[PDB]
Design a protein around this ligand. Structure first.
Ligand code: HEM
Ligand SMILES: O=C(C[C@H]1c2c(F)cccc2-c2cncn21)C1CCCCC1
Length: 374
């Protein structure tokens, strides 16, 4: 690990995100910081239409470009979805479409709000001298009062951070395989397994800070994109940048690099085959930051832990390897239950089976990677 932009303490998330942009962009940040009130009063759309076209030249360093991608992506969701009741904008105005697209191509991400914007760069500690717990943290932007974006974003972030403790171990895994250092490889695999077990505890916080009706009827609407979306059949037009409408996927934790990297690490071939699930997870790698995508490619080019463990006729190693797969299955089983409570039951009024089918395919693939199981 070196220039993969992966942090010791926080992993794939952006370390200590910038909260303020240069004063040259106070007109962007007034809108982003007040979307609850501006959306509800119906003045957001006119306020975005009335901004001038601001250059991206004053965004000098990485952290300010990431805040700007966050700021404009939030304004774009609000502009396109309005008050999230089904009356949508097919055109994004030039004054915000051009700088958003220019900044996006600079950072090699699509001009739509992605996971690495609203989770990995969308947080702050309340008091720097205290640890990274939900109580000492907060998001930087929200769409609507009571949309539960703080719970949803922050709990995803804390899971991402939990798993980041196991990322540190990955160089130990490959150095041990290369040097045939068997004892330290088994220690490495169980260390990876206990971090993934700790991350499962973090998942329980979702029930405390997100409620299903707000998630389903509100936050879901603002996280949606325009790829195969019937509300914008042809996609969104980026006035002044592409003449024709263009389709980009809405936010999806397939764009989280941390579960994709453990799939790669353990040889669970989630992107193998022609199926829709593999097709989808591969395409979501284009919505990850290039440093993290390059990291995934880098693990896929290392020797297979899985084939190393199978070739050695060593139970101890096989149990440690299964301890990691079991942790992943446990995570994905608990998360399928979240989705039953937060999407399936609300959708029937306390599409949906396409999502459940997707997650069960991923979990199935994972389950079938267990070794002396069957
Ligand atoms: C209210 C809570 C949640 C709901 C309703 C929910 C729902 C979903 C749905 C419907 C998908 C598949 C659709 C898609 O990604 O396009 C998905 C994928 C995924 N989600 Fe969540 N999720 C929630 C919480 C979380 C949290 C806190 C994490 C922590 C990082 C997470 C991690 C993932 C991952 C890694 C995937 C990719 C598929 C996989 O690796 O199994 N989810 N989620
Ligand atoms: O996958 C996602 C959203 C995605 C997401 C974000 F877009 C931003 C922050 C966290 C997540 C997240 C966590 N699990 C799925 N997702 C939606 C897909 C459509 C049904 C609602 C859930």
């Amino acid at each position: 690990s070196k220039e993969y932009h992966i942090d010791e303490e926080v992993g794939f998330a952006l370390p200590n995100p910038q909260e303020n942009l240069p004063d040259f962009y106070n007109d962007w940040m007034f809108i982003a910081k007040h979307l609850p009130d501006l959306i509800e009063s119906g003045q957001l759309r006119e306020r975005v239409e009335k901004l001038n076209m601001l250059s991206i030249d004053h965004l000098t360093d990485h952290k300010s470009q990431r805040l700007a991608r966050l700021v404009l992506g939030c304004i774009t969701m609000a502009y396109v979805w309005g008050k999230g009741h089904g009356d949508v904008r097919k055109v994004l105005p030039r004054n915000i479409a051009v700088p958003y697209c220019q900044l996006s191509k600079k950072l090699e991400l699509p001009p739509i709000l992605v996971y690495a914007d609203c989770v990995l760069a969308n947080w702050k500690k309340k008091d720097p001298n205290k640890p990274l717990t939900y109580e000492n943290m907060d998001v930087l932007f929200s769409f609507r009062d009571g949309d539960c974006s703080k719970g949803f974003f922050l709990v995803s972030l804390l899971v991402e951070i939990a798993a980041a403790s196991a990322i540190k171990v990955i160089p130990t895994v490959f150095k041990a395989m290369q040097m045939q250092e068997r004892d330290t490889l088994l220690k490495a695999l169980l260390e990876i397994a206990s971090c993934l077990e700790k991350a499962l505890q973090v998942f329980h916080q979702i029930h405390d800070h997100v409620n299903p009706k707000a998630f389903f009827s509100v936050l879901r609407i603002y996280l949606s994109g325009w790829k195969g979306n019937p509300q914008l059949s042809d996609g969104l037009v980026y006035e002044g940048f592409w003449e024709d409408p263009k389709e980009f996927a809405g936010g999806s934790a397939g764009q989280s690099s941390v579960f994709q990297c453990f799939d790669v690490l353990l040889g669970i071939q989630q992107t193998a085959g022609g199926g829709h699930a593999a097709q989808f997870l591969q395409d979501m790698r284009r919505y990850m930051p290039p440093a993290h995508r390059n990291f995934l490619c880098s693990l896929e080019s290392n020797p297979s832990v899985r084939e190393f463990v199978l070739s050695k006729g060593d139970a101890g190693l096989r149990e440690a390897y299964d301890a990691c797969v079991k942790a992943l299955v446990s995570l994905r089983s608990y998360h399928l239950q979240i989705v039953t409570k937060y999407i399936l039951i609300p959708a029937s009024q306390q599409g949906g089976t396409d999502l459940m089918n997707f997650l069960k395919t991923v979990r199935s693939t994972t389950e079938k990677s267990l070794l002396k199981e069957g």
